[PDB]
Amino acid sequence: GKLIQYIVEDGGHVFAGQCYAEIEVMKMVMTLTAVESGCIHYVKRPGAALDPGCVLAKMQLD
Protein backbone atom coordinates (compact mmCIF):
# COMPACT_ATOMS: atom_id res chain seq x y z
CA GLY A 1 0.00 0.00 0.00
CA LYS A 2 0.75 3.71 0.14
CA LEU A 3 3.10 5.44 2.58
CA ILE A 4 0.97 8.09 4.28
CA GLN A 5 3.60 9.51 6.61
CA TYR A 6 6.48 8.49 8.84
CA ILE A 7 5.82 8.75 12.58
CA VAL A 8 9.57 8.74 13.47
CA GLU A 9 12.25 10.77 11.68
CA ASP A 10 15.39 9.94 9.75
CA GLY A 11 18.36 8.85 11.82
CA GLY A 12 16.12 8.02 14.77
CA HIS A 13 16.59 5.32 17.39
CA VAL A 14 13.52 3.16 18.05
CA PHE A 15 12.24 0.53 20.52
CA ALA A 16 10.46 -2.78 20.51
CA GLY A 17 6.76 -2.43 19.77
CA GLN A 18 7.11 1.15 18.51
CA CYS A 19 5.22 2.42 15.48
CA TYR A 20 7.57 3.85 12.86
CA ALA A 21 5.36 4.43 9.81
CA GLU A 22 1.66 4.30 8.97
CA ILE A 23 0.20 3.02 5.70
CA GLU A 24 -3.21 2.47 4.07
CA VAL A 25 -4.01 -1.19 3.41
CA MET A 26 -7.49 -2.54 2.69
CA LYS A 27 -8.87 0.99 3.48
CA MET A 28 -7.35 1.00 7.01
CA VAL A 29 -4.53 2.33 9.16
CA MET A 30 -1.56 0.17 10.05
CA THR A 31 0.89 0.30 12.94
CA LEU A 32 4.26 -0.28 11.26
CA THR A 33 5.55 -2.00 14.37
CA ALA A 34 9.33 -1.95 14.49
CA VAL A 35 11.00 -5.30 15.14
CA GLU A 36 14.55 -4.32 16.11
CA SER A 37 15.84 -1.29 17.98
CA GLY A 38 18.14 1.10 16.18
CA CYS A 39 18.81 4.30 14.30
CA ILE A 40 16.49 4.20 11.30
CA HIS A 41 17.71 5.89 8.17
CA TYR A 42 14.62 7.22 6.39
CA VAL A 43 14.74 5.42 3.03
CA LYS A 44 11.23 5.86 1.61
CA ARG A 45 10.25 9.45 0.83
CA PRO A 46 6.49 9.75 1.43
CA GLY A 47 3.61 8.61 -0.74
CA ALA A 48 4.60 5.39 -2.52
CA ALA A 49 2.76 2.12 -3.03
CA LEU A 50 4.72 -0.31 -0.87
CA ASP A 51 5.52 -4.04 -0.75
CA PRO A 52 5.76 -6.71 1.95
CA GLY A 53 9.53 -6.48 2.41
CA CYS A 54 10.17 -3.00 1.00
CA VAL A 55 13.06 -0.96 2.41
CA LEU A 56 11.26 1.84 4.18
CA ALA A 57 14.14 1.83 6.65
CA LYS A 58 17.51 0.45 7.57
CA MET A 59 19.01 0.56 11.06
CA GLN A 60 21.72 -1.55 12.66
CA LEU A 61 21.20 -4.35 15.16
CA ASP A 62 22.42 -2.44 18.22
Answer for the pair 37, 11: CB distance below 8 angstroms, yes or no. Answer: no
Cα separation, 54 vs 44, whole angstroms: 9
Method: cryo-EM
Torsion, CA 10, CA 15, CA 20, CA 25, rounded to 10: 150
The length of the chain in residues reads 62
Task: Indicate the resolution in Å.
Answer: 5.9
Cα separation, 57 vs 8, whole angstroms: 11
List Cβ<8 Å contacts ≥24 apart for 37-42.
Answer: 37/13, 37/62, 38/13, 38/14, 38/62, 39/11, 39/12, 39/13, 40/8, 40/10, 40/11, 40/12, 40/13, 40/14, 41/10, 41/11, 42/6, 42/8, 42/9, 42/10, 42/11
Looking at this protein, which amino acid is placed at residue 40?
A: I
Looking at this protein, which amino acid is placed at residue 28?
A: M
